[PDB]
Design a protein around this nucleic acid. Structure first.
Ligand SMILES: [Mg+2]
Ligand SMILES: [Mg+2]
Ligand SMILES: [Mg+2]
Ligand SMILES: [Mg+2]
Ligand SMILES: [Mg+2]
Ligand SMILES: [Mg+2]
Length: 160
RNA sequence: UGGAGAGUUUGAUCCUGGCUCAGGACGAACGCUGGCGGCGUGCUUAACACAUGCAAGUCGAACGGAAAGGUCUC
């Protein structure tokens, strides 16, 4: 009962003595669609083994995302090795606006209102890494309240 | 109250970095097709040259006079 989507599929080549060797790497994003998201690179000779390894790695690397009612709390600006993607909270009426990789990761996480744009490299893996990094630097208002004190210096009009 | 990406350098990879695309818009033209109504718009080029008709007249309660109208008048 998980939601999975593949982001990029490509074939690699390595030169051997007698000829050519091929292999398949397929990044797969897995989640339950509410708050859980997983990232798996994966690599094998065949595409089924590759996406199976990607799914397994995503299950292993599942990580928690902070939500405030279907949207993120405050705008964030992550950066991968080369990917640069920023995320901003949006009105509940607005859907999810993002590219391929970013939208796949966000929809596996379970975000319904988000504004995402890519400003760095256009590589799918780096875009995914930048998006998940931004999700990591995303924090919780309750956590920052624990950090400072007096959990009143925050705005949560939606609440719930 | 509002931010999408895709293709393309390599034996395969990551960057940098060009080129192309997906969208909208117009006092528009072309190709094909073509029922109607509401509302708008229509020489963007030669401030090039123009046949022709109409686009600034009015007052007799300012004035001298009577061409015409009906007119009493010979
Ligand atoms: Mg770029
Ligand atoms: Mg490019
Ligand atoms: Mg080489
Ligand atoms: Mg070369
Ligand atoms: Mg770079
Ligand atoms: Mg006069």
């Amino acid at each position: 009962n998980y939601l999975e989507r593949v982001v990029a599929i490509n074939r690699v080549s390595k030169v051997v003595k007698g000829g050519r060797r091929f292999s398949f790497t397929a990044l797969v994003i897995v989640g339950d669609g509410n708050g859980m998201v997983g990232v798996g690179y994966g690599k094998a000779k065949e595409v089924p083994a590759a996406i199976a390894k990607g799914v397994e790695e995503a299950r292993k690397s599942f990580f928690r995302v902070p939500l405030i009612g279907g949207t993120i709390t405050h705008p964030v600006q992550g950066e991968a090795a080369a990917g640069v993607v920023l995320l901003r909270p949006a009105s509940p009426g607005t859907g999810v606006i993002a590219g391929g990789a970013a939208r796949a990761v966000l929809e596996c996480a379970g975000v319904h209102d988000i504004l995402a744009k890519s400003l760095g490299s256009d590589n799918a893996i780096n875009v995914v890494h930048a998006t998940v990094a931004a999700l990591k630097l995303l924090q919780r208002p309750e956590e920052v309240a624990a950090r400072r004190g007096l959990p009143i210096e925050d705005v949560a009009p939606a609440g719930m």
